[PDB]
Amino acid sequence: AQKSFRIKQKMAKAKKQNRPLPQWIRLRTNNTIRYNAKRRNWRRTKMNI
Amino acid sequence: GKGTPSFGKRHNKSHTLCNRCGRRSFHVQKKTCSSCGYPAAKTRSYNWGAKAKRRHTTGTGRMRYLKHVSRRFKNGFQTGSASK
Amino acid sequence: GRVIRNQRKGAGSIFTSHTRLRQGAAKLRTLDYAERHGYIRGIVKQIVHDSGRGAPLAKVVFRDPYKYRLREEIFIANEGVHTGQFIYAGKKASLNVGNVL
Amino acid sequence: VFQVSMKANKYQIKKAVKELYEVDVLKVNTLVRPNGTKKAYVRLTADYDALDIANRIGYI
Amino acid sequence: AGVKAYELRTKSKEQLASQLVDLKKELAELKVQKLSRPSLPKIKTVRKSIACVLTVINEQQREAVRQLYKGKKYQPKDLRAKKTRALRRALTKFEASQVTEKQRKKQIAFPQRKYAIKA
RNA sequence: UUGACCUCAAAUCAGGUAGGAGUACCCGCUGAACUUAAGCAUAUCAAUAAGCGGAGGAAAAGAAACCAACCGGGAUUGC
RNA sequence: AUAUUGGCGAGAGACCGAUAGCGAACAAGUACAGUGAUGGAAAGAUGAAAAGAACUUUGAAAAGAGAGUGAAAAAGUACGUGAAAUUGUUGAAAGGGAAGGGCAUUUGAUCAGACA
RNA sequence: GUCGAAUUUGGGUAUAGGGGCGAAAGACUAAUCGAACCAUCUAGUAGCUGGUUCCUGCCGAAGUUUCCCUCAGGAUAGCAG
RNA sequence: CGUGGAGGUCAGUGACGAAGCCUAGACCGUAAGGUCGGGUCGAACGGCCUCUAGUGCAGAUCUUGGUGGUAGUAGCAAAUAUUCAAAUGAGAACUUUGAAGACUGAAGUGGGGAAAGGUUCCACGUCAACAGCAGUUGGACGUGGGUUAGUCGAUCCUAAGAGAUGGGGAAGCUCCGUUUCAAAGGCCUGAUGCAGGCCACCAUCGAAAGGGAAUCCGGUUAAGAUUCCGGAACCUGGAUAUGGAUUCUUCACGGUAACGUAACUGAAUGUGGAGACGUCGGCGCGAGCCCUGGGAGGAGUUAUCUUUUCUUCUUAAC
RNA sequence: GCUUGUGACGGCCCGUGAAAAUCCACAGGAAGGAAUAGUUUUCAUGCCAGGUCGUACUGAUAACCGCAGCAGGUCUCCAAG
RNA sequence: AAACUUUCAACAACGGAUCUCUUGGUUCUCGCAUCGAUGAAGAACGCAGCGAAAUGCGAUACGUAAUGUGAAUUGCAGAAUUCCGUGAAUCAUCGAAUCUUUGAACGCACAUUGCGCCCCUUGGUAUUCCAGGGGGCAUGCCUGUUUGAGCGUCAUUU
Ligand SMILES: CN[C@@H]1[C@@H](O)[C@@H](O[C@@H]2[C@@H](O)[C@H](O[C@H]3O[C@H]([C@@H](C)O)[C@@H](O)[C@H](O)[C@H]3N)[C@@H](N)C[C@H]2N)OC[C@]1(C)O
Ligand SMILES: CN[C@@H]1[C@@H](O)[C@@H](O[C@@H]2[C@@H](O)[C@H](O[C@H]3O[C@H]([C@@H](C)O)[C@@H](O)[C@H](O)[C@H]3N)[C@@H](N)C[C@H]2N)OC[C@]1(C)O
Ligand SMILES: [Mg+2]
Ligand SMILES: [Mg+2]
Ligand SMILES: [Mg+2]
Ligand SMILES: [Mg+2]
Ligand SMILES: [Mg+2]
Ligand SMILES: [Mg+2]
Ligand SMILES: [Mg+2]
Ligand SMILES: [Mg+2]
Ligand SMILES: [Mg+2]
Ligand SMILES: [Mg+2]
Ligand SMILES: [Mg+2]
Ligand SMILES: [Mg+2]
Ligand SMILES: [Mg+2]
Ligand SMILES: [Mg+2]
Ligand SMILES: [Mg+2]
Ligand SMILES: [Mg+2]
Ligand SMILES: [Mg+2]
Ligand SMILES: [Mg+2]
Ligand SMILES: [Mg+2]
Ligand SMILES: [Mg+2]
Ligand SMILES: [Mg+2]
Ligand SMILES: [Mg+2]
Ligand SMILES: [Mg+2]
Ligand SMILES: [Mg+2]
Ligand SMILES: [Mg+2]
Ligand SMILES: [Mg+2]
Ligand SMILES: [Mg+2]
Ligand SMILES: [Mg+2]
Ligand SMILES: [Mg+2]
Ligand SMILES: [Mg+2]
Ligand SMILES: [Mg+2]
Ligand SMILES: [Mg+2]
Ligand SMILES: [Mg+2]
Ligand SMILES: [Mg+2]
Ligand SMILES: [Mg+2]
Ligand SMILES: [Mg+2]
Ligand SMILES: [Mg+2]
Ligand SMILES: [Mg+2]
Ligand SMILES: [Mg+2]
Ligand SMILES: [Mg+2]
Ligand SMILES: [Mg+2]
Ligand SMILES: [Mg+2]
Ligand SMILES: [Mg+2]
Ligand SMILES: [Mg+2]
Ligand SMILES: [Mg+2]
Ligand SMILES: [Mg+2]
Ligand SMILES: [Mg+2]
Ligand SMILES: [Mg+2]
Ligand SMILES: [Mg+2]
Ligand SMILES: [Mg+2]
Ligand SMILES: [Mg+2]
Ligand SMILES: [Mg+2]
Ligand SMILES: [Mg+2]
Ligand SMILES: [Mg+2]
Ligand SMILES: [Mg+2]
Ligand SMILES: [Mg+2]
Ligand SMILES: [Mg+2]
Ligand SMILES: [Mg+2]
Ligand SMILES: [Mg+2]
Ligand SMILES: [Mg+2]
Ligand SMILES: [Mg+2]
Ligand SMILES: [Mg+2]
Ligand SMILES: [Mg+2]
Ligand SMILES: [Mg+2]
Ligand SMILES: [Mg+2]
Ligand SMILES: [Mg+2]
Ligand SMILES: [Mg+2]
Ligand SMILES: [Mg+2]
Ligand SMILES: [Mg+2]
Ligand SMILES: [Mg+2]
Ligand SMILES: [Mg+2]
Ligand SMILES: [Mg+2]
Ligand SMILES: [Mg+2]
Ligand SMILES: [Mg+2]
């Protein structure tokens, strides 16, 4: 409901990072990334506040 | 049910977000945090905890100032600038 | 063995006294020039019930001797003291229920 | 409607709208966007037309 | 293109102030286009320009105050040399070499004498 | 009445300095038990682990209130 | 002169060779568990080079079939080699309450040698 | 069973391990309680149980003696190489 | 006999194919093992004389990984329940719409919140994985969009409680003490230090359910609204002027009184009142709801009956 | 009638049922005040200003915790015939 | 006789053994002496034309200045980009800066982006109320300065 800013800010950095790889990353040279490893989802890994 | 039906009551965070180290170790009712001991002056550490130590000591951070101090020492701690 | 009840009382965690509804510490007036030479009146304004005392309290107001204002004292109301009784305190006071000497 | 530094209040904002855009600000209500930006709804005095003040700053 | 550094050192200060406002007006326009456009790389050169103005501005006012305090005790700290806090304490060469009267006399009396042997 | 002395204070006074970090090595405080004893309490593990304080490029130690009993030796450290 | 499982900078080894070697050779003190102190992984190798399979064709697609690239698709981003358990199909054989073994020959299959 | 009170309950706040808390069951103290949990001392000790990785050749045992807080173990002589 | 590595040798084998793997093919040894052919393969490797060790596995309820039989098996049976047609789509028992049968029955399967979550909300795109059948649907995937306040909360105040400070203990990490054996600080006036009078409470944190300054209705969005749009308010803090009132009895009259009012100087210093309060019982009364007559409109039933059944008829803060 | 507010009372207690920040009043009589005009921001009207953080939705037989779209656990307001 | 079951083979599965690699680990030795109030270690939150991370940086934000080299950067897009040149570049180098919110963290707090105070300046008609902008107030202690306190105490006024 009515949340601390500190929380509503970390919430934002959260949402901001929930995204698939930028597909252009794959094309780079000597690029070893494939998918987004660290991807989270609300119902699976809760953030611990 | 010392089990599940009485885990259904866990809504109240024992700690919140520590300011100094960010660890969600900051004990509400105790107003101190269980990792670095903020607000204590020194930062909390022990020798049985070498894995904790290794986790938090210098070099897990940005080393913002300290990084270049080996360079700066290399040069004799120079002032002014190079000419051409 | 464990620590018995009667030892556990003494660092006073859940044992300390239930202090909330309490009218404040009952006391006489301080021992001053007015009581140890002359006498000094007061009025019992209010007698009122203390929580966790069986003994009613008398709220008795005096006149500050050294500045202009009223000062309230919390008196343990002896049987018969009533609302609006004058109360006299000091070496030279008289002998009547409720005066102090 | 403008994205606006979090570090600005309704004051420094209405100050920067008058200056940079030459317009008169009826009222400002700011909120903060789920991604950590501050959006501003800046209402112009009826003396101005926002549609017209808009494509003068060049977006449409 | 844009904003060489050596080129803003010869200019004076009031116009660097008014040249910046141009970069700022500029930058603020580019930002209104970059949301009309897929690509807007020019926007880099201008914002990195704004940095080079502000470099020289502050570079200037700084070497300004450095002279108007020069040659005296007590000039503000950030113009003092950084060295290290352990070098910043560090008995000075003057109060290092300082010798006692009685010792100065002995040095002079008998300092170390270069000699040698011959087999 | 005025001028000192002494002690004790107050300034966002003038300039300074201490705090945390790291800790392999170092100077101190504090301080076990597992263990060995085929049991176990002195003892051992050990003047060790854990805890606390404080340094440096090394620390510390050091020009003898030393060692010796010799025809004497001669600050300290280390092998 | 002595000390040095820390810091910075260097040369090396009859050391380890991705279940080894520091827990981490990888976005590793990561992901993740936990109220918390703490705990704490898995995971390297297409090829010289993407030349990463145009184009046709069946399919709603995924794909399949052709074609094509390449020294190699018995290298197709499930990619070097590709073992074993275990599994599909083809071939062969045998089997009246297990299977397997030893000696010996018949039969089927299959082979070396020798001679000239 | 109780259900208008020694009632139910939210949130805040106090007590921390030989300690707390207990209308008392050794109950409760984060699925942990006749002493929580975390790490380190710590590869704790074991006369006890389990295992202990190639081949062949020759030799080839003992369960008895004496002492032992010894009786599932040692020392000791005897057998064996 | 075999393995990893080292010194020496064979100017040893190799991209014209090293090493490894596969092979009821061939050979040597009692054996540990060694050799060969064929297949697969790609970049190194072996004999001999010595050196060295993290050197040989079937087991340790062994460690890590990998895989079977069980086995298309146990199972996918609480919470009354589904049906017909069409639309869409490659595909419909399961998605949409239409019709039907039902349920939760206002102590809800409705309408909102507190803790907690943290984008789930909403749109479009979408079906590899997930939704222990299905999936064209989703709380899934992908790209976006979205949360507007002087008045709603927070901020302020205090509660149990927590906790700086002169201090007192403790080798120390730190323990103790919040009035605490203290030289503790302000505030209003003026005549900017000055003249003054004071008042001297010595921190602070601790309530999104306690206290408390103040907003209502209508409309609006895909998603926000007591926040936005329209009108209509109130408060708090600053500024000042015009009217009004008051005075030649200077700081208002009237009313016996209780009281009146459009107003109708006020420094401290004091005092008083709201802040400010249990619980239950019955009685009164208000507000919303319930029921219901007349009538003005819409809806249903009408073989038969019913001046009938249903429903609109409203009024915010100020 | 139902709900909810509220009043005036009554029962109850060895239980008698918070505190602070605020707002007002009163006592009070410092001081300042008219007649050629003076006092009056608690009567009316009129001007400027009100920042900052939160505000979506769920609130549960799928949005929380129970390893999960778990027959469990988890505070409350509204309530028709 | 099939089916089925077993056993061997080839192809195909399943799985990741072997072998060969090796920007890593390990140990040995050699040399060096540098964190912090001049805000350190660490923390949160940000920065890119197009990034979720690693690495890097701080509202001048994969970076600014300065010096060296001498033409690249590259995944695409992009450059009055400018190549016999104060000049490409994610280059090296680093001597000058920036350096958000913090943190021993210092005005007071901090489950709050919560609440003061003082100085300069600007704007609202303003010493005073509101706002914008720059600049400031922690503690212990030493040296010194200025102002003070006490019949602690010494002189000196008539
Ligand atoms: C190859 N696999 C084996 C194959 O060896 C053979 O097995 C025979 C077996 O049938 C013979 O036969 C025997 O075993 C069978 C069996 C069904 O138990 C019995 O029914 C029978 O009584 C008995 N005589 C036995 N004596 C020797 C094996 N080699 O038969 C087929 C199989 C059992 O699958
Ligand atoms: C020389 N010895 C005495 C010394 O014994 C001590 O005495 C204290 C005295 O100061 C206290 O007294 C003081 O402190 C107390 C405190 C406890 O709150 C206060 O209540 C009291 O009013 C106050 N005067 C007294 N109440 C206790 C004595 N032992 O301190 C005072 C002293 C004169 O220095
Ligand atoms: Mg590579
Ligand atoms: Mg490559
Ligand atoms: Mg979980
Ligand atoms: Mg959790
Ligand atoms: Mg949380
Ligand atoms: Mg609970
Ligand atoms: Mg708690
Ligand atoms: Mg965590
Ligand atoms: Mg550890
Ligand atoms: Mg130099
Ligand atoms: Mg008490
Ligand atoms: Mg807002
Ligand atoms: Mg806001
Ligand atoms: Mg300075
Ligand atoms: Mg140092
Ligand atoms: Mg000073
Ligand atoms: Mg220190
Ligand atoms: Mg001791
Ligand atoms: Mg041991
Ligand atoms: Mg023993
Ligand atoms: Mg023993
Ligand atoms: Mg120690
Ligand atoms: Mg040395
Ligand atoms: Mg020394
Ligand atoms: Mg001497
Ligand atoms: Mg000697
Ligand atoms: Mg090194
Ligand atoms: Mg490994
Ligand atoms: Mg590992
Ligand atoms: Mg658990
Ligand atoms: Mg390789
Ligand atoms: Mg490669
Ligand atoms: Mg094909
Ligand atoms: Mg090949
Ligand atoms: Mg081919
Ligand atoms: Mg193969
Ligand atoms: Mg290949
Ligand atoms: Mg495979
Ligand atoms: Mg392959
Ligand atoms: Mg096989
Ligand atoms: Mg049978
Ligand atoms: Mg048998
Ligand atoms: Mg059978
Ligand atoms: Mg047989
Ligand atoms: Mg009843
Ligand atoms: Mg409770
Ligand atoms: Mg409750
Ligand atoms: Mg709580
Ligand atoms: Mg005990
Ligand atoms: Mg105790
Ligand atoms: Mg339990
Ligand atoms: Mg035994
Ligand atoms: Mg036995
Ligand atoms: Mg080895
Ligand atoms: Mg075989
Ligand atoms: Mg071959
Ligand atoms: Mg081969
Ligand atoms: Mg090769
Ligand atoms: Mg071994
Ligand atoms: Mg093996
Ligand atoms: Mg095995
Ligand atoms: Mg064996
Ligand atoms: Mg199984
Ligand atoms: Mg299976
Ligand atoms: Mg099946
Ligand atoms: Mg079936
Ligand atoms: Mg079945
Ligand atoms: Mg069942
Ligand atoms: Mg159709
Ligand atoms: Mg159909
Ligand atoms: Mg269905
Ligand atoms: Mg029903
Ligand atoms: Mg709702
Ligand atoms: Mg809701």
Ligand SMILES: [Mg+2]
């Ligand atoms: Mg959709």
Ligand SMILES: [Mg+2]
């Ligand atoms: Mg399914």
Ligand SMILES: [Mg+2]
């Ligand atoms: Mg499916």
Ligand SMILES: [Mg+2]
């Ligand atoms: Mg939805």
Ligand SMILES: [Mg+2]
């Ligand atoms: Mg989505």
Ligand SMILES: [Mg+2]
């Ligand atoms: Mg507000």
Ligand SMILES: [Mg+2]
């Ligand atoms: Mg408060």
Ligand SMILES: [Mg+2]
């Ligand atoms: Mg304290």
Ligand SMILES: [Mg+2]
């Ligand atoms: Mg103190």
Ligand SMILES: [Mg+2]
């Ligand atoms: Mg103290």
Ligand SMILES: [Mg+2]
């Ligand atoms: Mg409240």
Ligand SMILES: [Mg+2]
């Ligand atoms: Mg309101």
Ligand SMILES: [Mg+2]
């Ligand atoms: Mg909107």
Ligand SMILES: [Mg+2]
């Ligand atoms: Mg809505």
Ligand SMILES: [Mg+2]
């Ligand atoms: Mg009148």
Ligand SMILES: [Mg+2]
């Ligand atoms: Mg109350």
